[PDB]
Each structure stands twice: as structure tokens, then as C-alpha cells.
Amino acid sequence: MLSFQYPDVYRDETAIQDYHGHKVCDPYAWLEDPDSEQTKAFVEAQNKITVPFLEQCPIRGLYKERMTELYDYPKYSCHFKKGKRYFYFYNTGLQNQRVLYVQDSLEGEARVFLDPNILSDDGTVALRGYAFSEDGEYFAYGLSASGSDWVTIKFMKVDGAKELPDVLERVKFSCMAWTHDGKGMFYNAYPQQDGKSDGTETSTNLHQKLYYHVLGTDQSEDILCAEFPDEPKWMGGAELSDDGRYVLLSIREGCDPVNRLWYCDLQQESNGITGILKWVKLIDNFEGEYDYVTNEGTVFTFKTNRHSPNYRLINIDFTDPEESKWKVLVPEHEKDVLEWVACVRSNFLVLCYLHDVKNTLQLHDLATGALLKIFPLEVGSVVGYSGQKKDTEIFYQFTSFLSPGIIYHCDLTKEELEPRVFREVTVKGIDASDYQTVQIFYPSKDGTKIPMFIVHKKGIKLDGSHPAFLYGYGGFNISITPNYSVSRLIFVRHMGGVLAVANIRGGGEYGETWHKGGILANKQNCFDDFQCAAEYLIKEGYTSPKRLTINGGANGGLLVATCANQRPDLFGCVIAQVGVMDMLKFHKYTIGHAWTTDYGCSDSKQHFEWLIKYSPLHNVKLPEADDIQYPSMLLLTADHDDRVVPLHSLKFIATLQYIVGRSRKQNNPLLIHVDTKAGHGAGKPTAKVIEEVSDMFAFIARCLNIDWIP
């Protein structure tokens, strides 16, 4: 029969909970405890069968070698100036973590400023956030170990790259902002909690507070500047205005792009920062987002979505704060989303728009908002930018599906502006001209036209014979734009596959209306959109059900897992990374309470009724037809993923193996791989990234029996 046997997993049939009258059984509830011998044994047993399966066919080694070769290309970030020096991140190619360099001039020799690689043998300690003092002489940086969201903030004196004694603990989802007097830095921290705080715990994160750390002191001396004891879920991030006069507090609750905005005129403090600041509650509700751009005196420019779904720029004068008095600096565009805006060279605004899922970059006048210059870009994404108000030049990084980055530079002091190539890297082995990217719009179930990028070798016959890899996310106002992925291109070139990315609802591709189209009561829209994408690829002849692989991560993991339950006949392989699988209990762990803005919460009868319909953990069912089985599935998670606690995947795989894996007609494998010293994904070292993609494509290869193409 099969080559391996699924592990014995105890079913606690007494675990029954009542959700507003509906009895729900959770037989693997015990997997919620990561510290138990039972759970440890479970993980060990699952990995024991997954690893040999993935490593059996030599195609994995072929893929790993090719990935190690092709991924070995110089990787730079935009240069950015702080004080009298320039900084930039650079990875020579295969370093586990990118290194931060410093140079005293653009033509000067660069030296290593911060090398995270020497902090661990395996590169599992990574930089997570940083902040330079206004004068650029001091530097704060966060470090996370094993992929955890938890951070320890450390400090350095820039001149000489001197280590300082200051260390801040209990930092997570924190701001980092220095006051311009150079005395200290604002940051967020959570209260002491029982148990561990290393990324392996599941404990809910509440009561985050805003503190001020004076350089040269112990964290126990830190000043508490803002706290919301009556609102446990609020999170207040601080930033200083460009002139350093005001502390702007952005309070968020949940993941919607909205925030309260309070301010503190530092000059009005009785005796400096000594306790809870004299906050003026400018915007004291969660009805809209207000993202600070710059200010001229009391006139503050904010990027907002207040009655502007595609976003716009408005000016609020603190001296005449009523909404009826706000000035619209740059009106909302009928369809293009204003993604972000930066102020540079005092009176210039850099605006980045998303037009049909492709970026555009424009320069505008701060005083009038009028368009001054269009920066030419090919089809793709702007994924990096540098240029603060006092800077006189900008750098920006562009990427696409077929090419790594091109970093451009533009000296804004020249009357005739014209960006110039500053850095460009070419991957030897992947000739971009051999492939093509197309964008099509397909109708979903309800008729809504959804965009989808498709990348493939030029001149293929659309006869349905090609394996395909369809990616999707769908939620949280996140736009899935073009990105350079050598791993995916190896699938195209060496596995003869077709790549597709569906910009389903719930994302931010078409503004807040697109986001609202895939949340709460309408979450099913996401799944319908994605299923329709698969149907489009099949109908048009790009692939066939048995040769189609779907992939998503986190909320995207929820996407592909649900699609496997709803339309098992439509896919051949499903790879769900760090997915949210238990939609009834997600809100109980770590930062999960924040996702209720997209999903709702089971505590509500109304929400429960939406959730129970698509929750992956609660919708595993044998297909009715004798000729339909579940697709091959691979769940990927890690023991320090404190963003989406691994229990989601643990309970889901147990359920799949028991309900579906035991069926005689099920021949496709249902596996999970739980990595160690890793988390959700941010900061994952190069070595691990390579192993992961090798596991993914090896799985696809074995399940669909795809031959390697040298």
C-alpha cells in the first residue's frame, strides 16, 4: 500500500465546547500545549515520516544545488544617509543575514557596521527594526532569536561602532523613535508574564505600553508615557515630527488601516519627559488612517483613507483642527491607490501609486500638491526608498518577476531632475528574455473582475500540460505585487512550470473597497476568487487539476487550506505555510486578537456563523465521489512561530490524517514539517530559506511526478 504509516495520535473525544448552541468537538485540543511530552512526541513522529519522503527523490538535491547557485548574487538595499554618513545593507550572496555597512561619503570606502552573522553559528539571530538618532551619531537596533517576534533592543555609538551598555527587554511590535535632543528613545514593551517569552509560548499579548528610555540608564528607570489599562488591545506607536517639536502617537486596535492620532508638543511639557505626556487627542476614534508625512509649523500633512478608499493627502492645522477645515492637498485618484508618500528636500513629496498592481513613482510640490516629475519605471514594484525631509537626494529600489533589483539615485538639487542607475545586478543563468509576464482579469463567481499575473516561458502551447504554481494571500489590505523570486523561476526553467499570482479580494490592490470585499461576512469571496483563478488557468490551458499546485502563507495558508476542503478536485498539490487553521480559537493566542478586524471573532454568534463555514480545522470531510480524494498536502511551520502559533498546523494535520488519511481512496500524502529555531519567516537565514524552497518543490516534484529539466 503506502510507503509510510501515519503516527498514532490520541483523540480526546470528551473535548466538546458549545458555541452559541453549536457543539464543537476538538479532539486534538491537547496539541495547544507546546511543552508537553505528548505534543513533543507528536512533532517528532510527524517529522520522522516527512523528511524521508521529501529527501527520497534526488530531484531535491538537484533543486537545492541549483538554488544555491542562482541565489548566489549580490543583494543590496538603498543607501540612506544619517548625519554625515551613508549606510546600506548588503549580502555578498549566500550570507545567512545581510550586513549593514557604513561609509563617510558616496565615493568613500565602506566598512562593516553591524554583521548579524557573527551572532550565531546558524544565522538565527537577526536584526528586527532599528532607529538612528536625529544627528546620526547614535543607533538603536532590535534583535530577534530563532524567528520570534520578541525583540531585545541594543545600542551603539556610530563613530567607531562602539557597543553601549543599554539593553531593553520585553519589546514586541514596537516603535523606535529618538527625541531630537538626543537624550533618549521611545519604544513599546509588554508587562512581565508568567512562563516563557521566547517565541514558543502561546500567551496572548495585551497591555502594550509606550516607554521612553534615557540613554545611559537602566530599563528599570524608563518613563511610562502612554498606557491604556481600560483598552488591553490598543497599541500606541510614537514618532517625532520632522522638526522634532511634536511626539505623534498612532493608536491601533486590530489590523484595519485606521488609527487614533494624538500629539504632544514637547515644548509644553512642564519639565521634560517625566511621565504620562500632555496628549492632545486630535483624532480620537478609529474611523480612518492618518499617516504622518511632514509638517510646516502647525500644519500637518497626513496620508489618509478618511472617506477616500484609494487614499489621499490632507493638511490638518493643529490650530484649526475641525474636519470641516482640513485642506485636501492631493485628492484621491478614481482608481489608483496611493501606497506611500515621503517628504524630501524640504518641499518635495514623493508619491508611490499602485496602478493595476504595478508601481508608479511621482514627485510633487509640498505647497500645492501639483505633479512636478514622473520617474520612469518598468512593470514591477518599488520595494525600497530613502530620502528624509532634510535630505537632498533620493534612492529607490525596483524589482519585478524576471529581474532582481535596480537601485536608482536622483540628486534633487539639480534643476533638471533625472534618476540614474546606481546599482544593478544580473543573475547569470536566468535569461529574462526567455520568459514573459502577462496580466489578465478574470471574472469571479459574482462577476467581479480579479487581476492575475502569469509568468511563463515564451511560446508555450496552452494545451494544459504544464505544472502550475498559483499563489494567493487575500486579506489585511496587503497588495501582492511583482517580486523577484529565483526559487519560483527554477520551477519555471527546471521544472517547466507556469507561475501565477491572483490578486484576490481582501487585499489592498484596489483600496479599502477591495479589502472590505474579502473580510468578515464576505471572507468567502477570497476563496471564491482563488478557486476561480485556478479554474481560469485550467480553462485557458495553462495547466490541469492534477498538475496544479496552490501555495499561500499565514492568512494565505488559511486560503489554500480552505480551498483544499472546498474544491479538492481542483488541485493536485497544496503547500500551506504557517497558516491560520483554527478559526474558532485563533484570537486566544499571542497577537491573534488583532486579526478579528478581518475575520470576526467566534465569541460573537454572528461571526461564529461565518467562521464555522470555512474554518479549515472544522471542514475536513471526505469527498463524496469515489473518484475524488484530497490533493497532496504539505503544511510548513516552526516551533518559534509566535505570530501564528504552530498548534494551528498541528491540529489541522492530525485532523487531515485521521479523517482523510485513513480512507482507502486517499493515496496522496498529507504531511507537516515543523522546523526548529525558526518562526513565522521574517529574519529567516539564507541557509534555512534554501532548505525550505527545496522541500517545497521536491514535494511538488514527487507528488506530481515531474522530471527535472537540466
Contacting residues toward ligand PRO, per CB under 6 A? 476, 554-555, 580, 595, 643-644
CB 524 within 8 A of CB 442: no
What is the grid cell recorded at 17? 465546547
Q: Which residue is nearest to ligand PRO (CB)?
A: 554
CA distance 566 to 620: 9
In one-letter notation, the amino acid at residue 599 is Y
- The least distance separating ligand PRO from the CB of residue 423, rounded to whole angstroms, comes to 30
Task: Select 481 or 555, whichever has its Cβ closest to ligand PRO.
Answer: 555
CB atoms within 10 A of CB 173: 17
Task: Select 369 or 475, whichever has its Cβ closest to ligand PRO.
Answer: 475
Task: Select 353 or 476, whichever has its Cβ closest to ligand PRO.
Answer: 476
Task: Select 377 or 644, whichever has its Cβ closest to ligand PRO.
Answer: 644
Task: Select 86 or 595, whichever has its Cβ closest to ligand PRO.
Answer: 595
CA distance 616 to 597: 19
In one-letter notation, the amino acid at residue 25 is C
- HEC string of 38-86? HHHHHHHHHHHHHHHHHHHCCHHHHHHHHHHHHCCCCEECCCEEECCEE
- The least distance separating ligand PRO from the CB of residue 621, rounded to whole angstroms, comes to 24
- The least distance separating ligand PRO from the CB of residue 680, rounded to whole angstroms, comes to 6
Task: Select 133 or 596, whichever has its Cβ closest to ligand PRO.
Answer: 596
Helix axes 37-56, 647-659, angle to 10 degrees: 70
The helix/strand/coil state of 537 is helix
| Sequence-distant (≥ 6) Cβ neighbours of residue 11 within 8 angstroms | 27, 28, 658
- The least distance separating ligand PRO from the CB of residue 194, rounded to whole angstroms, comes to 25
CA distance 651 to 585: 12
For 256, counting Cβ atoms within 10 Å of its Cβ (0-12 exposed, 13-18 middle, 19+ buried), the class is: buried
- The least distance separating ligand PRO from the CB of residue 522, rounded to whole angstroms, comes to 17
Task: Select 476 or 697, whichever has its Cβ closest to ligand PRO.
Answer: 476
CA distance 638 to 672: 10
Task: Select 364 or 593, whichever has its Cβ closest to ligand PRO.
Answer: 593
Task: Select 286 or 326, whichever has its Cβ closest to ligand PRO.
Answer: 286
Task: Select 555 or 629, whichever has its Cβ closest to ligand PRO.
Answer: 555
Look up cell 492534477; give the residue: 546
The helix/strand/coil state of 141 is strand
Task: Select 86 or 586, whichever has its Cβ closest to ligand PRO.
Answer: 586
Task: Select 302 or 586, whichever has its Cβ closest to ligand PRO.
Answer: 586
Task: Select 547 or 643, whichever has its Cβ closest to ligand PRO.
Answer: 643
| Sequence-distant (≥ 6) Cβ neighbours of residue 44 within 8 angstroms | none
CA distance 222 to 506: 40
- The least distance separating ligand PRO from the CB of residue 258, rounded to whole angstroms, comes to 16
- The least distance separating ligand PRO from the CB of residue 554, rounded to whole angstroms, comes to 3
- Report how far apart, in Å, the C-alpha atoms of 33 and of each of 36, 40, 193, 220, 689 are: 6, 9, 17, 32, 27
- The least distance separating ligand PRO from the CB of residue 596, rounded to whole angstroms, comes to 10
- The least distance separating ligand PRO from the CB of residue 552, rounded to whole angstroms, comes to 9
- The least distance separating ligand PRO from the CB of residue 636, rounded to whole angstroms, comes to 13
The helix/strand/coil state of 655 is helix
The helix/strand/coil state of 634 is strand
CB atoms within 10 A of CB 707: 9
Q: How far apart are the first and last CA of the chain?
A: 32
CB 301 within 8 A of CB 315: yes
CB 105 within 8 A of CB 79: no
CA distance 303 to 330: 9
In one-letter notation, the amino acid at residue 519 is I
| Sequence-distant (≥ 6) Cβ neighbours of residue 93 within 8 angstroms | 71, 72, 73, 74, 75
- The least distance separating ligand PRO from the CB of residue 691, rounded to whole angstroms, comes to 21
User: Can you list the positions of beta strands (E) in 412-547?
Assistant: 420-424, 435-443, 449-457, 468-471, 498-502
CB atoms within 10 A of CB 42: 23
- The least distance separating ligand PRO from the CB of residue 550, rounded to whole angstroms, comes to 16
- The least distance separating ligand PRO from the CB of residue 602, rounded to whole angstroms, comes to 16
CA distance 19 to 2: 38
CA distance 386 to 482: 20
Task: Select 597 or 629, whichever has its Cβ closest to ligand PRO.
Answer: 597
CB atoms within 10 A of CB 228: 17
Task: Select 291 or 641, whichever has its Cβ closest to ligand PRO.
Answer: 641
CA distance 176 to 212: 10
CB 150 within 8 A of CB 199: yes
CB 563 within 8 A of CB 538: no
Task: Select 389 or 643, whichever has its Cβ closest to ligand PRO.
Answer: 643
- The least distance separating ligand PRO from the CB of residue 579, rounded to whole angstroms, comes to 8
Task: Select 82 or 648, whichever has its Cβ closest to ligand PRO.
Answer: 648
Rounded to 5, what percent of the chain is helix, strand, coil? Answer: 25, 35, 45
- The least distance separating ligand PRO from the CB of residue 643, rounded to whole angstroms, comes to 6
- The least distance separating ligand PRO from the CB of residue 517, rounded to whole angstroms, comes to 17
- The least distance separating ligand PRO from the CB of residue 580, rounded to whole angstroms, comes to 5
